[PDB]
Design a protein around this ligand. Structure first.
Ligand SMILES: *C(=O)[C@@H](N)Cc1ccccc1
Length: 255
RNA sequence: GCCCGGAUAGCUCAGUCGGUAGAGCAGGGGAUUGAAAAUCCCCGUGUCCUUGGUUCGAUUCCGAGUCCGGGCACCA
């Protein structure tokens, strides 16, 4: 899908539109192979990008160029560390490794986006979370140091979400020996890292970042404070499905 | 993955069983001016996206393909 009704609110046209995007992954995959940024999702992002490179007499009176792609490869760490003792950094290593696994599971789409005209970047875990996280976490806690801000409401909502998720997860294996306070606090840590990912990402990348869903968790609270007056955080919503196979160039298995 | 709409003059779209599809823009020709600029008037051979059927005949009715959207399922 798209948001043509949202293109005029910013009112910056007749030029290349710097865009970004960030994918995620859950520990226990309920939909298994089906997930965000599947093959259909990447091909549909490419198609929605190419839809603005056509109709030059109807878009001048929408363009897609210079794009980037982020990955929260270092977000769901403690989510996977519950299965085995392992280590604190080993859980990171493995989760970011699966992130890079997907990054290689659809590299053809990333490279073919460059043939369609759009640039291709590849942000990762450390590539973003490697600078200015002390002041970021400090500001997150400064917003979460009072029950008046809706940051506590979003905290409780995401906490209930991750709590149901971790309850269903540990309901299969009770050998984790984790704590309810531990699950809640690790979920809140991931949530605050996602909230602090508005400051660091909005400052690291120019203009806007688009996700298929809404993704207003933490991003709204932080970006309305800082990014909305430094680098406008505009979230565009995408949405596709499966019905008729589109034309995919070099759509074959590697050999 | 499942389910629901459209494509018509060059372009926008309006056309409701199946009863020779027309309003706006554009564009050509005019009268009048010395000439243009306003105003009036004339001007559409459209397989209604191709290709198989009912009919007396199908725009929209049934079958096959091409291209634009929607509603769900999965939220994280
Ligand atoms: C899921 O765990 C999300 N918090 C991860 C995420 C999604 C989109 C953008 C940034 C982070």
């Amino acid at each position: 899908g798209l948001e043509q009704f949202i293109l005029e609110n910013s009112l910056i046209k007749n030029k290349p539109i710097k865009i970004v995007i960030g994918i995620s992954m859950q520990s226990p995959h309920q939909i298994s192979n089906e997930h965000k940024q599947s093959g259909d999702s990447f091909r549909a992002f490419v198609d929605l990008l190419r839809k603005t490179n056509e109709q030059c007499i109807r878009d001048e009176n929408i363009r897609i160029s210079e794009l980037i792609v982020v990955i929260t490869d270092g977000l769901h760490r403690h989510n996977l560390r519950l299965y085995k003792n392992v280590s604190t950094t080993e859980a990171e290593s493995e989760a970011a490794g699966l992130g890079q696994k997907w990054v290689a599971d659809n590299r053809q789409f990333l490279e073919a986006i460059g043939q369609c005209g759009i640039s291709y970047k590849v942000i990762h875990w450390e590539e973003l979370k490697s600078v200015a996280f002390n002041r970021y976490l400090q500001i997150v806690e400064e917003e979460y140091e009072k029950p008046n801000s809706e940051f506590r409401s979003i905290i409780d909502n995401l906490t209930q979400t991750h709590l149901e998720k971790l309850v269903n997860f540990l309901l299969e294996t009770r050998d984790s020996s984790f704590t309810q306070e531990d699950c809640v606090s690790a979920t809140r840590k991931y949530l605050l890292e996602e909230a602090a990912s508005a400051f660091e990402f909005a400052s690291l990348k120019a203009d806007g970042m688009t996700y298929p869903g809404p993704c207003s968790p933490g991003f709204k609270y932080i970006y309305d404070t800082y990014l909305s007056e430094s680098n406008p955080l505009p979230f565009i919503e995408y949405g596709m499905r499966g019905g008729k196979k589109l034309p995919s160039f070099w759509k074959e298995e590697s050999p």
